[PDB]
Amino acid sequence: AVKTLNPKAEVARAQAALAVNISAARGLQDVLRTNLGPKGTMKMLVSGAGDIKLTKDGNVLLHEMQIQHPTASLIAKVATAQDDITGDGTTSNVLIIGELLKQADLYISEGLHPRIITEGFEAAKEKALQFLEEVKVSREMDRETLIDVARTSLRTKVHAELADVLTEAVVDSILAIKKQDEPIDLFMIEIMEMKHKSETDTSLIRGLVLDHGARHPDMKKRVEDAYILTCNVSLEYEKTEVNSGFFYKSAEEREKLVKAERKFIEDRVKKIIELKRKVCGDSDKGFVVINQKGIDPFSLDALSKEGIVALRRAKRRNMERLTLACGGVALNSFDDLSPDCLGHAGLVYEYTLGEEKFTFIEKCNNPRSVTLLIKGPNKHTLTQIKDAVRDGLRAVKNAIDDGCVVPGAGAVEVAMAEALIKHKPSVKGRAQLGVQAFADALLIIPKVLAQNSGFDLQETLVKIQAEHSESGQLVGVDLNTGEPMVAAEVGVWDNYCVKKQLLHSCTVIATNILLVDEIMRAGMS
């Protein structure tokens, strides 16, 4: 039509674009469905630049699987949001999405106008969330509780052994993280990775590790007791902000001009050394310094003759972790210098690897910042596990965040289904159709679970489709026998908000997705 307006423009139509979009997701869900579920397979990507992936979390796939179909890109965005919200189940989220739209299509393919079904969805989610709200299990921050949940989450990505090794570190971090009210996960979580010696030996360090080393050979590699200097003011030379052209007349002055120029930094370092010497009058104690900017070699020499450990050019967030590590008082002005401003560590050495240098912080009495040092055999795997790690953490932060918890492995969805299928047309009737498919779409999670597990779908669903008695249980599908399972008893759990948001996210996605007619493209050349 508007092709009249523009020849080069492109338009779809109500019937046309509708099918296109559902076709688009139907393909999209097909690829990703292999993944979620511990039996699922992570995927490897190759850049046109030749880089390499080994990932399973779909958002990474979607963000990096170069596609042009718009709805997918739209779906990609919310999935990325979900990644910025919780991290996994984005897997399920899209699988929820297209499958809903597929079931949605079935009825409009019967000519049903979509507007009605949306309202059915509107009612459907409400009842579901109503059920969702009540069914979450209020659980304390028992170490094991989260431990199982961490293992519950972490198995989604890696070896059973690998996550199990990983499981201990994250939870203890979580334990060593809270100030009993509010986590931010940024400072206290240091994720550093080394191409070193294994995948499994990746470990929590009770202290901190640094991405660089001292710039002087005489610099002490290892120190028993560390007294910490946290700072950012440059001890490299600097010349003042005003144009300040000087001359001299004598080469003697030239040297006199040599010494004068250095004198300012000379005092700066001098203030610290006296403080160090005011502090470390003992020979046994070792003194360490950290700068966010760089340091003069002459200053380096200044410390060198005093055998002073100092570090330069730190990322702006590290000092927070340092303050969260040693209780050191991060400062700029060294004239206002106090020993109480110091930080203290029980042990420091440096670790040299490859060509780089890595530095080690050890033995805080009550460390409040820790580090997930990632030991790596292979670069992609480090990147690979890291996503699994950050996912695993964000699972826990919500897990602690919510004093309740959802038993995982889709036992909820059947519970959603039966309750939702147990809805009379208290609706205006025509909506009961959309509700029916809405409930129908929910069973995909175990379906693909059995599918990813290889067990036949239809029979297993019917099997687990047995609420037993008055204790019609929250029953999961066994991930290795395809059988009814108490996720709670077996300790398979999930974040309530995860379950919360995804339903909300998908629903809003769905209704608008169904509520477009043609896809316009009339843009400038």
Binding site: T4, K77, S244, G245, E320, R521
Partner: protein, 521 residues
């Protein structure tokens, strides 16, 4: 070779029809998009992004064309949108259809000027008509406004969330009233900041008693939570700034160089103590911040933010009532950041945000939009934009109109009453424009999908009785409905410019007779 060398020209009826046709297209491509039963459209921007939106303006604002009057039609949409927000759901669809019949006298060899002449006559009665059939409303009563707003918003996808936005729109609108104009206080929708954050749910988005900043404390030692802070808006930078006169120094003696470097230290510290002398708590500036001073301001345990956008600084200033300063020595305590009920900086999830709540009687506010995805969010706020906009228009005029086409038929027969009493050749144009009006409820029928002809005739038949004027068309039942119970109520001024714009479109395109291309300048 004479005139302009390959610049095309055309004249007369072919031009006339061509403009007639294109608008017919122009209106047509959107006729699906009005009404509580409307559709919702998603667009390809040329550079890859996606916008999904029902508001016609952006749709047309996102439309590239070659024929001019369409682009001429384009701006008309955005103009009324700019002035009114919505009706863009309808105005153009009114417009082209007006033109659609407007052509019908071109074959009547009637010179358009008279046809214009009747039009100006026609609108005059139309405006007079609506004023007669308008209804003033109290502005203090919240619930009717909320009813008005949902009446105003039960057209867009946020329909499921009417309760939230209605109060949401009302609250921000009410809290923006700048009374230093005497009793001529004026609200602003640019101090009505809108912040869209994905994640969360619609229910999580809320009106914040203050401002939200996508920045962080410069230093950890500054507290991230304060009840009643004092806030400083330093328009100037916090550091040493050029001696503007290409200044130069010639030192000769050794100590001089070291001396000067302290002096900049001294100059900076100077700034610090001037700040603290007013015992402030929070530091905000559009420029950078010296960490060394920030050490000092850390040393004073005084919260500091650097490089903040100016409009926000104003709204921040409008949040806490303080006034921005570029001169620490000339800083004045009348601008102490008092009016701060709570200071905080939360973690949204990968982002710190600055939380400024419970000002006493704040005039500035930002709405926090927390949803699924920004295109969803961006769609929402556009609807919010319309929602708040009409409210101020309601705050601009208390007189209301019943829409749903009810008013439309009211004028329609009214002009018919005028038409038969206004004998002459111009009569036939006059009724024709009345004939044009009838389509909007008709269009509503299709968006519902009902027996349009029968319902319309009955509605006209229904509106033949003078006793009833609020009889309009329900969105969903597609049945004749008096508006009083239905409650789809609208600002009169919304409809005024609607017709005002509609008819302006008509005359402008009608005088056209010619096309000229290839200007080359």
């Amino acid at each position: 070779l004479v005139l302009s060398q390959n610049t095309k020209r055309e004249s007369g009826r072919k031009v006339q029809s061509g403009n007639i046709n294109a608008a017919k297209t122009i209106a047509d491509i959107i006729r699906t998009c009005l009404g509580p039963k409307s559709m919702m459209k998603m667009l390809l921007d040329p550079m890859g992004g996606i916008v999904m939106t029902n508001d016609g303006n952006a749709i047309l604002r996102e439309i590239q064309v070659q024929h001019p009057a369409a682009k001429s039609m384009i701006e008309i949409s955005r103009t009324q949108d700019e002035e009114v927000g919505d009706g863009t759901t309808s105005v153009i669809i009114l417009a082209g259809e007006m033109l659609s019949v407007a052509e019908h006298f071109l074959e009547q060899q009637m010179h358009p000027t008279v046809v214009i002449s009747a039009y100006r006559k026609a609108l005059d009665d139309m405006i007079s008509t609506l004023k007669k059939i308008s209804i003033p409303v109290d502005i203090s009563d919240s619930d009717m406004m909320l009813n008005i707003i949902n009446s105003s918003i039960t057209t867009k996808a946020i329909s499921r969330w009417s309760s939230l936005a209605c109060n949401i729109a009302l609250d921000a609108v009410k809290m923006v009233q700048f009374e230093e104009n005497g009793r001529k206080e004026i609200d602003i929708k640019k101090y009505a900041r809108v912040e869209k954050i994905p994640g969360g749910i619609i229910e999580d988005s809320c009106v914040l008693r203050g401002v939200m900043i996508n920045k962080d404390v410069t230093h950890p030692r500054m507290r991230r939570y304060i009840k009643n802070p004092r806030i400083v808006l330093l328009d100037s930078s916090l550091e040493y700034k050029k001696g503007e006169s290409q200044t130069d120094i010639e030192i000769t003696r050794e100590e001089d160089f070291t001396r000067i470097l302290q002096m900049e230290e001294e100059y900076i510290q100077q700034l610090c103590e001037d700040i603290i002398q007013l015992k402030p708590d929070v530091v905000i500036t559009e420029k950078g911040i010296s960490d060394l001073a920030q050490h000092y301001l850390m040393r004073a345990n005084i919260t500091a933010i650097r490089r903040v956008r100016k409009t926000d600084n104003n709204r921040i200033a409008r949040a806490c009532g303080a006034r921005i300063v570029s001169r620490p020595e000339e800083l004045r305590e009348d601008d102490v950041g008092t009016g701060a009920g709570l200071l905080e900086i939360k973690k949204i999830g990968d982002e710190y945000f600055t939380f400024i709540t419970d000002c006493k009687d704040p005039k500035a506010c930002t709405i926090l939009l927390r949803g699924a995805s920004k295109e969803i969010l961006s769609e929402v706020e556009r609807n919010l934009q319309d929602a708040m906009q009409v409210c101020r228009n309601v705050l601009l005029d208390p007189q209301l109109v019943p829409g749903g086409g009810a008013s439309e038929m009211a004028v329609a027969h009214a002009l018919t009453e005028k038409s038969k009493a206004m004998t002459g050749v111009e009569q036939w144009p006059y009724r024709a424009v009345a004939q044009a009006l009838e389509v909007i409820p008709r269009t509503l029928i299709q968006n519902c999908g009902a027996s349009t002809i029968r319902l319309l005739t009955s509605l006209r038949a229904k509106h033949t009785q003078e006793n009833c004027e609020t009889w309009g068309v329900n969105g969903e039942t597609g049945t004749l409905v008096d508006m009083k119970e239905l409650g789809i109520w609208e600002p009169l001024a919304v409809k005024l410019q609607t017709y005002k714009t509609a008819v302006e479109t008509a005359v402008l395109l009608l005088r056209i007779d010619d096309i000229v291309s290839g200007h080359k300048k």
